[PDB]
Design a protein around this ligand. Structure first.
Ligand SMILES: Cc1cc2nc3c(=O)[nH]c(=O)nc-3n(C[C@H](O)[C@H](O)[C@H](O)COP(=O)(O)OP(=O)(O)OC[C@H]3O[C@@H](n4cnc5c(N)ncnc54)[C@H](O)[C@@H]3O)c2cc1C
Ligand SMILES: Cc1cc2nc3c(=O)[nH]c(=O)nc-3n(C[C@H](O)[C@H](O)[C@H](O)COP(=O)(O)OP(=O)(O)OC[C@H]3O[C@@H](n4cnc5c(N)ncnc54)[C@H](O)[C@@H]3O)c2cc1C
Ligand SMILES: NC(=O)c1ccc[n+]([C@@H]2O[C@H](COP(=O)([O-])OP(=O)(O)OC[C@H]3O[C@@H](n4cnc5c(N)ncnc54)[C@H](OP(=O)(O)O)[C@@H]3O)[C@@H](O)[C@H]2O)c1
Ligand SMILES: NC(=O)c1ccc[n+]([C@@H]2O[C@H](COP(=O)([O-])OP(=O)(O)OC[C@H]3O[C@@H](n4cnc5c(N)ncnc54)[C@H](OP(=O)(O)O)[C@@H]3O)[C@@H](O)[C@H]2O)c1
Lengths: 399, 399
């Protein structure tokens, strides 16, 4: 691979990539440009233990496996010239590159109807966001969440534990409409409702007036704070300007190659093939950020290595629910292991397509999740009666 | 650009590309691999004048502006090795390349429910298809068309003119669901119905038994021949196998670059940015095939040339209706010029979005189409009252 290496973005995907470059044996220059003036850190605690307990030194990413990297923190890459092989920085400097890696992630989507709001409206992506929101998470305050996705629901649980009244507006009929089985989504709504979350389905925010939010059904919700969690948009502006193929995300193959020679991309900023669906998708999971970063680095140092091939999965910690989801949300059959109950929730879902496992969910059942991911990866076709039988040991079965 | 040049596919996009390479001044080797054993030819007459009059020598593409090209006709490219820079051919030979261009187009989608049918079921894409279908286009025979898109409707008109009884099954509520304003689609249904086409909306074919087609509504249609026109699938298998980013189409930027260095793609096989919608789409128009091919070639020979930038448009000749459509099918406003009538049809539609022209349709009104495409290209915001006023001259206005 061509030195020097320059990475744009200093999130999980970037850190994972540069650590793997070093581990795989690349000893040339690596320079990382990160617009946040923060020691690189992991985002999931921002909706949970950080939001609750406030210690950022418990959430930093370990860069020790990435020795001899210059991290330019608090600096924004403004453009790159793919012919000159240079990157223009906000501090006035220019970096040369042999290989450029775009790991710029994604930014929260804003709600146009709250654009000119005069009440506190925040999104939750950065340490700065978390600190700002947390400052207003006072007991008996009223929090309104817009969006029924995982970030909002993680925040909902954390806020309720802090004694914050929580209302949530979801424009669709169900929570977690993206990459979650309906059976899971239905249960998760039941759980949050039972914890005091005031859920509003099939409602959209139409605007706001002096501390009160307005909805499509002509009604009102007053709140001390709105946190908007309606998804993210890829940070692909530099790629678009430089002539790379992008569409809310930079298109890459399994080697992380963009359409521009010597420019790669990885993490949340990418649109890539989901091997289960066979379609291109923006995969915005923590596991993708890390594993795609590692795979792209490994193949750069050793071109005989295979391309990225991992199947997608994530977790979401929502109060008492430790949720794990792998693969596709549905197939032609769902198998349920255990009872689906608010009384000490513990259950496993298995999605199949023509007898083949194409997805799985575990709630408070991590022991089963790893063997199911192994079964999923090889497209296993186990006996559906055995899969249902609670007598069955999935770990054993995966062999 | 790097010699030698090898192009896979010998359709309109390929011919247009190689002619532009030569015209722009590239004098190195060009070899084109075409799986059809046919002198390169244009496809639109296959649903019209060829289907009716049968002379293939009236439909060949002019390769005269492409001198010194070796056309390997009747040969299939089976794979390419992007590291070795070679292409493996079905006749046992291998071609070396400096630059590889994938212009392999798309193939008609098959209908799974007719997979094991015992009655004649054809698609219409090639000269061989056309000849085969035409052999059965006997007066008073009964033709069933599956799909409400342009190819089927063009065939419907040609068949009706030949005295063939025509029934058509469309799974959606309207014809031309892709890239046609609803106002146009509604009128086109009225026209075909008035010409004797038996239109069946919101019906799907569920199967067939001994010369009779079965539908989702539990009913039957008997026919002497079925022509299936339910869209196409990109011929991107070689790209997928070689590790390029694809998803029913090869992703390319405005230079025609794929994710693989030294490999380009153009025409029906590509997924590319539509500058009006700002989204990636497979654009399967004749004008795209030609203009994208020309643009990619021009930039290969002269890297200072801009990338492909044309806005999409097509025509469709359906009996008495000469239809032209440019840009987006809808905006926040449609302006109608003229009466929409089966009595000597002649009218123009203009789609606007926040005052800006984003699309237009002309039916039997070619004079207006060129100035509207010029207005469209520059994002014109004309006075909506003037646009409506039939006193207005659009050609004048476009200046
Ligand atoms: C609140 C929260 C909770 C989460 N919880 C979960 C969870 O329960 N499960 C799960 O699977 N995932 C969770 N995620 C974590 C998530 O999946 C990862 O953070 C993400 O996938 C990492 O991707 P990334 O490194 O590509 O992007 P990012 O983390 O966004 O990093 C990209 C960095 O590049 C910066 N950048 C952008 N443009 C430029 C530029 N021009 N110059 C320099 N820098 C630039 C960005 O500002 C950013 O700092 C959560 C995320 C959040 C925000
Ligand atoms: C019946 C019909 C009517 C039409 N009428 C209209 C119309 O009214 N308006 C309009 O805008 N467009 C019309 N189109 C025309 C159309 O838009 C063009 O034909 C098309 O866009 C050309 O794209 P192409 O050159 O990329 O692909 P193609 O024409 O499909 O050419 C690709 C060629 O590559 C070959 N190939 C594939 N794989 C390999 C391989 N491994 N090795 C070698 N060769 C390979 C294919 O077989 C094919 O011959 C019509 C098409 C048809 C079929
Ligand atoms: N996966 C995780 O997803 C995290 C981030 O995304 P997120 O939690 O903020 O959102 P999300 O997981 O993508 O889901 C967000 C919710 O907002 C809704 N939504 C999307 N666009 C909207 C709009 N324009 N107006 C109103 N609602 C809209 C979505 O519902 P719909 O599906 O109905 O659009 C969805 O319910 C990633 O970090 C990753 O961890
Ligand atoms: N544009 C032109 O389009 C030409 C070729 O495409 P075409 O005319 O054959 O098709 P098309 O223009 O893409 O439209 C085909 C019709 O078939 C329908 N269809 C798609 N998939 C189907 C399925 N699985 N089962 C039943 N119906 C289905 C589509 O309706 P839906 O939109 O409802 O899918 C559409 O009405 C190109 O050559 C180009 O000239």
């Amino acid at each position: 691979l061509k030195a020097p290496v320059v990475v744009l973005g200093a999130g999980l995907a970037s850190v994972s990539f540069v650590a793997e470059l070093r581990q795989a044996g690349y000893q040339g220059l690596i320079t990382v440009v990160g617009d946040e003036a923060e020691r690189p850190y992991d985002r999931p605690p921002l909706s949970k233990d950080f939001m609750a307990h406030g210690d950022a030194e418990k959430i930093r990413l370990d860069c020790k496996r990435a020795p001899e990297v210059e991290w330019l923190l608090g600096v924004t890459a403004q453009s790159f010239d793919p012919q000159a092989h240079t990157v223009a920085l906000s501090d006035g400097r220019t970096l040369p590159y042999g290989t450029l890696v775009l790991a710029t992630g994604a930014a929260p989507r804003a709600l146009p109807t709250l654009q000119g709001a005069t009440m506190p409206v925040h999104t939750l992506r950065t340490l700065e966001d978390a600190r700002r929101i947390q400052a207003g998470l006072r007991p008996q305050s009223r929090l309104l969440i817009v969006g029924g996705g995982v970030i909002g629901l993680e925040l909902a649980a954390t806020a309720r534990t802090a004694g914050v009244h929580v209302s949530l507006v979801c424009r669709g009929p169900r929570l977690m409409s993206r990459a979650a089985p309906a059976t899971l989504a239905d249960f998760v709504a039941r759980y949050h409702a039972a914890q005091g979350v005031d859920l509003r389905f099939e409602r959209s925010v139409t605007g706001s007036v002096d501390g009160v939010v307005l909805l499509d059904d002509g009604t009102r919700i007053a709140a001390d704070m709105v946190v908007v969690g309606i998804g993210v948009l890829a940070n692909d502006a530099l790629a678009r300007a430089a002539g790379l193929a992008c569409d809310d995300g930079i298109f890459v193959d399994a080697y992380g190659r963009t359409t521009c020679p010597d420019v790669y991309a990885l993490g949340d900023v990418t649109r890539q093939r989901n091997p289960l669906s066979g379609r291109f998708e923006r995969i915005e999971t923590w596991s993708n950020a890390q594993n795609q970063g590692i795979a792209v680095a490994r193949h750069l140092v050793d071109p005989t290595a295979p391309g990225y091939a991992e199947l997608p999965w994530y977790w979401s910690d929502q109060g008492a629910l430790r949720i794990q989801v792998a693969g596709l949300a549905s197939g032609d059959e769902e198998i349920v292991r255990g009872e689906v109950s608010l009384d000490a929730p513990k259950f496993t879902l298995i999605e199949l397509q023509k007898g083949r496992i194409v997805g799985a969910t575990c709630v408070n059942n991590a022991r089963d999740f790893a063997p199911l991911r192994r079964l999923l990866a090889v497209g296993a076709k186990p006996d559906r009666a055995a899969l249902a039988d609670p007598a069955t040991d999935l770990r054993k079965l995966a062999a």
